[PDB]
Design a protein around this ligand. Structure first.
Ligand SMILES: [Ca+2]
Ligand SMILES: [Ca+2]
Ligand SMILES: [Ca+2]
Ligand SMILES: [Ca+2]
Lengths: 149, 194, 97, 176
């Protein structure tokens, strides 16, 4: 949903961008309006591709781009940036310091913040399971292949 | 010829072991191409030991272990060296020792083979190349073994023929061509009765 | 009026305010009145119907709470979707979907 | 390590036994302090838990300065000890056995040993494969309990201990 993907500030910024394209203010983006801003940016496209880049996001097929369609375009652009990198943030939650390894103390820190509590001994049980190298720290490579700590 | 090169010696199928820990020795009188290890009862006489899945052998000529191929293992032997072949069917491992010292691969692996399925069972086996002489000691006389006490006695392994009256009957691959029926499942040849 | 609302940043920044104002109820009631009259022989003012339906579809995509609010009228939309096949574009069946 | 291959049997009694005995009593002294801390739980036990960690860390350093030499010496003399029973060899088994028991019981002992190996980049694999390389022959490369010298030395000295027991004692061993 747009509320999940976009914040109030981003919606305001997109509206200003939409108004930059819509010099008329009627609420729709025509080919000439889209072509004008492209020339200001240096590009000189033809109407054949200019229509194509409108039809690619025009939902109702009226031939013009309104704000609901403009927001829907930007909502997809924000969403599809992250595809499978969600494990990177999950790794950094356990990795407080910022290096490439998860320490037992760092695993204690996240477990302390979470509801479940450890008796300072079973923390070694799952870290040695995740850490195959046996160095006492779980790196990023060990975390993605199998997640226990 | 291709066939009068390797002579395979194995125990009789009636001595097949499917449980327990067993030990026997093989003395390399010569230093050429000789292989020793454990083989399944369905071992084929015209195939080199370890070239298929029916045998787990150690090639002491150049320090290799053979099972579905060759990979380096241990060190080459010398004249008079005794190879102690140990199989553990409780842990599904095979251990080879040379003069009482356990052979190791290019790692910390103290066992030549791991996770071996019992299935039909295993039999002691050895193969000798052209001009090769070897002594096989299945341990009918426990005092005759030269390195069983050094490595194998304290680990719970027993001689393959510890309590047996007659010497273990052995079968050898005789390189005399014979006519046999064409197998119904032969990969290359099919016979149709019209 | 629908176009101006969908061109307003407040409509997207404050979905809860739009829900409190009953904007989706008001648009739905206008649509069904047109669909109610001539429910079998002919649907008139098709552009108004597809404008209201398109508005409600974008209304659902703003937030899950808006989507849940329109879900409460799922049966109400379905009973008016029998003749919505005649109109092409955005239909009450599309709003239900 | 290369020069131990020519060591004489007299080094077992003259040098190795007195040295390991000092390590054995040091290990017992530290674990005695460790159990003293846990019997009286306190907020001050942390101030002192670091002390035994330091004592375990220095102890593990001493063990890894002697065990690689001891392991190679055992390999070149285990055959003689099994062929002819040796009182000194049996005594060495008790010393390495008690150190292993201390290592297995103490939680800090395992932790400090693991820290010592990884921080000092101890191979723990060349110490066990040097003889194979001397004879011209991944999973836990950083550290593994299987390749730990504290347990590797015991497993090499285990046949010496089993050689003391008669075969009639197998039933008693299972009961114990
Ligand atoms: Ca315009
Ligand atoms: Ca449009
Ligand atoms: Ca870290
Ligand atoms: Ca690691």
């Amino acid at each position: 949903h747009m509320a999940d993907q976009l914040t109030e500030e981003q919606i305001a910024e997109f509206k200003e961008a939409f108004s930059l394209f819509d010099k008329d203010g009627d609420g729709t983006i025509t080919t000439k309006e889209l072509g004008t801003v492209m020339r200001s940016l240096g590009q000189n496209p033809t109407e054949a591709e200019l229509q194509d880049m409108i039809n690619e996001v025009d939902a109702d097929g009226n031939g013009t781009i309104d704000f609901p369609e403009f927001l829907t375009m930007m909502a997809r652009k924000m969403k599809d940036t992250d595809s499978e990198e969600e494990i990177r943030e999950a790794f950094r939650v356990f990795d407080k310091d910022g290096n490439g390894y998860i320490s037992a103390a760092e695993l204690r820190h996240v477990m302390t913040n979470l509801g479940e509590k450890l008796t300072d001994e079973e923390v070694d049980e799952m870290i040695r399971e995740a850490d195959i190298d046996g160095d006492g720290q779980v790196n990023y490579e060990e975390f993605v292949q199998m997640m226990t700590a | 010829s291709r066939w009068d090169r390797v002579r395979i010696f194995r125990a009789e199928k009636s001595y097949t072991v499917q449980s327990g820990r067993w030990y026997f020795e093989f003395e390399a009188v010569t230093t050429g191409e000789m292989r020793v290890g454990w083989a399944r009862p369905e071992l084929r006489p015209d195939v080199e030991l370890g070239a298929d899945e029916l045998a787990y052998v150690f090639n002491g000529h150049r320090g290799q272990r053979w099972h579905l191929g060759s990979e380096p293992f241990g060190r080459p032997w010398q004249s008079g060296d005794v190879v102690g072949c140990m199989i553990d069917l409780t842990e599904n491992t095979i251990i080879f020792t040379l003069n009482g010292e356990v052979l190791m691969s290019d790692s910390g692996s103290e066992t030549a083979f791991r996770e071996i399925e019992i299935g039909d069972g295993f039999l002691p086996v050895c193969s000798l190349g052209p001009g090769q002489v070897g002594h096989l000691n299945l341990g009918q006389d426990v005092s005759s073994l030269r390195f069983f006490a050094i490595c194998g006695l304290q680990e719970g392994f027993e001689p393959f023929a510890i309590n047996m009256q007659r010497p273990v009957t052995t079968w050898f691959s005789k390189s005399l061509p014979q006519f046999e029926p064409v197998p119904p499942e032969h990969p290359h040849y099919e016979v149709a009765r019209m | 009026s629908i176009g101006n609302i969908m061109n307003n940043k407040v409509f997207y920044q404050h979905p809860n305010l739009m829900r409190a104002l009953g904007m989706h109820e008001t648009v739905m009631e206008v649509m069904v009145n047109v669909l109610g009259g001539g429910e079998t022989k002919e649907i008139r003012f098709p552009k108004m119907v597809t404008s209201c339906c398109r508005f409600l579809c974008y209304f659902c995509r703003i937030s899950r709470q808006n989507q849940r609010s329109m879900f409460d009228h799922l049966s109400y939309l379905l009973e008016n979707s029998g003749i919505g096949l005649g109109m092409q574009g955005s239909t009450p069946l599309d709003v239900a979907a | 390590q290369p020069i131990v291959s020519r060591a004489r049997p007299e080094l077992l009694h003259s040098h190795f036994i007195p040295t390991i005995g000092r390590l054995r009593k040091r290990a017992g002294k530290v674990v005695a302090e460790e159990e003293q801390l846990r019997l009286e739980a306190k907020a001050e036990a942390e101030e002192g838990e670091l002390l035994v960690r330091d004592e375990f860390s220095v102890l593990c350093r001493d063990l890894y300065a002697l065990y690689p030499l001891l392991i190679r010496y055992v390999d070149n003399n285990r055959a003689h000890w099994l062929t002819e029973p040796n009182a000194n060899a049996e005594e060495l088994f008790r010393m390495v056995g008690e150190i292993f028991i201390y290592w297995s019981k103490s939680h800090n002992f395992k932790r400090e040993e693991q820290n010592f190996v990884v921080q000092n980049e101890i191979n723990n694999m060349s110490f066990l494969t040097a003889d194979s390389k001397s004879k011209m022959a991944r999973r836990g490369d950083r550290y593994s309990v299987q390749t730990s010298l504290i347990v590797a030395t015991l497993k090499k000295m285990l046949p010496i201990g089993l050689n003391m027991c008669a075969p009639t004692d197998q039933d008693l061993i299972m009961l114990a």
